[PDB]
């Protein structure tokens, strides 16, 4: 059995330490107990295996030994809906992932760029957020809006985008309640917020299902969004088309996925850029040099030439990746190849790919946000390891890499290229339109709110904006 981490009280264990700051908690535990330990997380023994080998052990674990959906389903199933994601066996997840991956081809991503640019530009023109030549804005609130508009406009389609002008705003706010910290223990309890979650889940499904049906009734296709796509990409291995309900639920899940992860990340980008005016000027000059002084429209093709924009994202993900903790249930006992250790089935296991990304071993002056450290290498997709196809195409199991913001193994992100496209596009447009600065006498960046397993800026962070024109 791995070394149990010292705590003071029963069933609180190291929850508070972990919840306040996972990374500081993991590094301290590391210095005192090595690369493997067990801490009591809300009553559950939770074995943490750190370092690249830890990530490999947990993320490349066999389906026999490690279960994800068992740990997640109580929380996510009420939110996303039935028969998708984690409310099915792995094999079905793998196909659903394949379906979405289908929907995210170059032709799809191509079409999304001018739609995303238009949303950002129209937001900046129309929102109260940025009225005036010079001002302050709430970064997280503003960025969350921009991400929801950009993702729903491109990925979700016209009808959903348009409904965010009326009811979807309130629906998604209420559905998001499902991710309340309390639902890590009572996701099944009919507390008032969960009641609102469910009402919201139901009406959201309803509307999607109406949008789908109304498409069929016109017998037509008009764009590259994931709808027209799942309607056609309905076919499962056994010949069954994905039912309208599963499509609705998949879309809900994809909106939730993008919103949480991307909005957090884009917020951090803005906050970093505000602390680093040198870097923003570089980005601006890169756009001048690589696209021209006339600053022509952003396209899928010319974005990929924005080398520093990409590194700004990569480096931000290195320090601020939204998911800090990947947890699996141990289903059959497992042992650590190089040790006497064995992990019982009363344990969960936890990987933290964020730990290696801010380690001195792998990254010199790790806590320094410097995009230029990537001058050694850049890729929006990088893989030098062996490859495994789990059902949604070939992907690296890559964990010799200390940098895994999109995870690894069968459960790894299939949103990664869309995320880059969206973050890259938002950033490029913002870089054209603005300069950002911290508020008077504020140095550096805000604290991180570690909650709901989603990192984000803590508190209400304003930065100053000035329009270039
Ligand atoms: C910066 C942006 C993003 C980050 C950092 C991110 C991170 C991750 C990580 C770490 C995982 C693995 C989770 C695990 O092992 O349990 C993952 C899985 C996934 N992500 Fe993302 N993601 C991002 C954006 C997106 C977007 C935009 C979408 C969809 C549009 C998406 C859809 C998914 C899906 C479907 C999975 C698979 C879950 C599974 O197989 O169990 N992600 N993501
Ligand atoms: O939002 C989630 N998954 C996203 C991931 N994603 C987004 C972008 N790319 C990937 C997602 C994936 C796929 C798709 Cl299709 C859509 C989405 Cl949105 C998500 C998944 C599982 C869990 C969950 N399971 N147990 C907990 C849990 C959490 C905390 C805790 O104690 C902590 C403390 F102490 F702090 F309180 C106890 C827990 F049991 O959490 C919570 C959230």
Curated annotation (Swiss-Prot):
- Which SUPFAM superfamilies would you find in this protein's record? Cytochrome P450
User: Which cofactor is recorded for it?
Assistant: heme
In terms of superkingdom, the source organism counts as: Eukaryota
UniProt activity-regulation remark: The activity is completely inhibited by miconazole and reduced by voriconazole (6% substrate conversion), posaconazole (10%), itraconazole (16%), (R)-N-(1-(2,4-dichlorophenyl)-2-(1H-imidazol-1-yl)ethyl)-4-(5-phenyl-1,3,4-oxadiazol-2-yl)benzamide (VNI) (20%), and (R)-N-(1-(3,4'-difluorobiphenyl-4-yl)-2-(1H-imidazol-1-yl)ethyl)-4-(5-phenyl-1,3,4-oxadiazol-2-yl)benzamide (VFV) (31%). The weakest inhibitory effect is observed with fluconazole. Activity is also inhibited by ketoconazole, as well as by the azole-based drug candidates VT-1161 and VT-1598.
Q: How does it sit in the membrane?
A: Single-pass membrane protein
Supply one GO molecular-function term. Answer: oxidoreductase activity
- Residues annotated as binding heme are 413
Gene (UniProt): cyp51B
- Which Gene3D superfamilies has this protein been placed in? Cytochrome P450
PANTHER family tied to this protein: 24-HYDROXYCHOLESTEROL 7-ALPHA-HYDROXYLASE, CYTOCHROME P450 FAMILY 7
For the keyword Methyltransferase, the answer is yes
Please give the record's induction comment: Over-expressed in azole-resistant clinical isolates.
List other remarks.
Answer: In Aspergillus, the biosynthesis pathway of the sterol precursors leading to the prevalent sterol ergosterol differs from yeast. The ring system of lanosterol in S.cerevisiae is firstly demethylised in three enzymatic steps leading to the intermediate zymosterol and secondly a methyl group is added to zymosterol by the sterol 24-C-methyltransferase to form fecosterol. In Aspergillus, lanosterol is firstly transmethylated by the sterol 24-C-methyltransferase leading to the intermediate eburicol and secondly demethylated in three steps to form fecosterol.
Q: Which GO terms describe its cellular component?
A: endoplasmic reticulum membrane
Q: Which top class of enzyme applies to this chain?
A: oxidoreductase
Q: Which biological pathway?
A: Steroid metabolism; ergosterol biosynthesis
Q: Name one GO biological process term.
A: ergosterol biosynthetic process
Where would you find this protein in the cell?
Endoplasmic reticulum membrane
Its keywords, alphabetically, are: Endoplasmic reticulum, Heme, Iron, Lipid biosynthesis, Lipid metabolism, Membrane, Metal-binding, Methyltransferase, Monooxygenase, Oxidoreductase, Steroid biosynthesis, Steroid metabolism, Sterol biosynthesis, Sterol metabolism, Transferase, Transmembrane, Transmembrane helix
**What is the protein name for this chain?**
Sterol 14-alpha demethylase cyp51B
Q: What is the role of this chain? A: Sterol 14alpha-demethylase, encoded by cyp51A and cyp51B, that plays a critical role in the third module of ergosterol biosynthesis pathway, being ergosterol the major sterol component in fungal membranes that participates in a variety of functions. The third module or late pathway involves the ergosterol synthesis itself through consecutive reactions that mainly occur in the endoplasmic reticulum (ER) membrane. In filamentous fungi, during the initial step of this module, lanosterol (lanosta-8,24-dien-3beta-ol) can be metabolized to eburicol. As a target of azole drugs, plays a crucial role in azole susceptibility.
């Amino acid at each position: 059995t791995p070394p149990v981490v010292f705590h003071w009280f029963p069933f609180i264990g190291s929850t508070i330490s972990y919840g306040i700051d996972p990374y500081k908690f993991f590094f301290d535990c590391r210095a005192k107990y090595g690369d493997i330990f067990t801490f009591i997380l809300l009553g559950k023994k939770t074995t943490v295996y750190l370092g690249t080998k830890g990530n490999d052990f947990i993320l490349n674990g066999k389906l026999r030994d490690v279960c994800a959906e068992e740990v997640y389903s109580p929380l996510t199933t009420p939110v996303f809906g039935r028969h998708v994601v984690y409310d099915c066996p792995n094999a079905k997840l793998m196909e659903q992932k394949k379906f979405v991956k289908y929907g995210l081809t170059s032709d799809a991503l191509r079409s999304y760029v001018p739609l995303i640019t238009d949303e950002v530009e129209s937001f900046v023109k129309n929102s109260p957020a940025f009225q005036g030549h010079k001002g302050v804005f709430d970064v997280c609130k503003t960025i969350a809006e921009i991400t929801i508009y950009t993702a729903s406009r491109s990925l979700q389609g016209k009808e959903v985008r348009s409904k965010f002008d009326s009811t979807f705003a309130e629906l998604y706010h209420n559905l998001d309640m499902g991710f309340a910290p309390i639902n890590f223990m009572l996701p099944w309890a009919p507390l008032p917020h969960n009641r609102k979650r469910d009402a919201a889940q139901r009406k959201l499904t309803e509307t999607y299902m109406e949008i789908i049906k109304a498409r069929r009734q016109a017998g037509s296709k008009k764009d590259s969004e994931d709808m027209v796509w799942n309607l056609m990409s309905c076919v499962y291995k056994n010949g069954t088309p994905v039912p309208d309900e599963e499509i609705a639920h998949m879309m809900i899940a994809l909106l939730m996925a993008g919103q949480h992860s991307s909005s957090s990340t884009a917020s951090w980008i803005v906050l970093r850029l505000a602390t680093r005016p040198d870097i923003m000027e570089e980005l601006y000059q890169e756009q001048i040099r690589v696209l021209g002084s006339d600053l022509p429209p952003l396209t899928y093709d010319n974005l990929q030439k924005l080398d520093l924009h990409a590194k700004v994202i990569k480096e931000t993900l290195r320090l601020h990746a939204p998911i800090h903790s990947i947890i699996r249930a141990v289903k059959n006992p497992m042992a650590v190849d190089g040790t006497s250790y064995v992990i019982p089935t009363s344990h969960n296991v936890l990987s933290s790919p964020g730990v290696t990304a801010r380690s001195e071993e792998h990254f010199p002056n790790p806590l320094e946000w410097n995009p230029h450290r990537w001058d050694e290498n850049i890729a929006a997709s990088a893989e030098d390891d062996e490859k495994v196809d789990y059902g949604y195409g070939l992907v690296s199991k890559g964990t010799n890499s200390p940098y895994l913001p999109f995870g690894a193994g069968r459960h790894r992100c299939i949103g990664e290229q869309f995320a880059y496209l969206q973050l890259g596009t938002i950033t490029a447009v913002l870089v054209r339109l603005f300069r950002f600065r911290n508020l008077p006498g504020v140095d550096g960046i805000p604290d991180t709110d570690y909650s709901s397993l989603f990192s984000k800026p803590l508190g209400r962070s304003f930065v100053e904006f000035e329009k270039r024109h």
